[PDB]
Design a protein around this ligand. Sequence first.
Ligand SMILES: [Cl-]
Ligand SMILES: [Zn+2]
Ligand SMILES: [Zn+2]
Ligand SMILES: [Zn+2]
Ligand SMILES: [Zn+2]
Ligand SMILES: [Zn+2]
Lengths: 11, 137
Amino acid sequence: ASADSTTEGTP
Amino acid sequence: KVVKFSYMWTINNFSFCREEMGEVIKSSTFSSGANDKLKWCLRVNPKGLDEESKDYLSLYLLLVSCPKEVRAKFKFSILNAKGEETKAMESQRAYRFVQGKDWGFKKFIRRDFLLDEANGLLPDDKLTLFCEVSVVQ
Ligand SMILES: [Cl-]
Ligand SMILES: [Zn+2]
Ligand SMILES: [Zn+2]
Ligand SMILES: [Zn+2]
Ligand SMILES: [Zn+2]
Ligand SMILES: [Zn+2]
C-alpha cells in the first residue's frame, strides 16, 4: 500500500 | 516533534448509491486539541472515483486550514460491531500537506467486504472509520 492523492503535486 | 492524534467518524445512513449518498462525503474537522488550530477532515468516495478503484471505498485525509510547513503520517481503520480495529492501512512515510491537499488510499476497502455481513462493518448502515494522524509539523 502506497498512498495516493486526488490532486497532482502540492499543489 | 511528532504530535499524534485521532478522529472517529461515524457515517450514518450509509448507502452505495451515489445519487443518495453523494459522490464525495466529508467528516467534521478535527485537530490534536482545542489549542491546535490546524484543522483536518476525512473524505470518503463511497464508490471509488476512478475505474481502478470502482469496486472500492476510497478514504483520504484532507488538510482544511491554511498552515502557518506541514507533513503527516496517517493510518486508517474500520471499527467493527465489537469496536475493534480492522482492515488498517497506513502510510509508509509522512507526506507534505498544504491547504486543500489530501493523501490516502483509493483502494482502502473492497465494497463487497463491507457488504459481507459476517465482518460486522455496516451495522444499522453506519460505517465507523478511525484515523490516526502523526504530524511532524
Ligand atoms: Cl505510503
Ligand atoms: Zn439511489
Ligand atoms: Zn443507485
Ligand atoms: Zn446511479
Ligand atoms: Zn517542515
Ligand atoms: Zn489504533
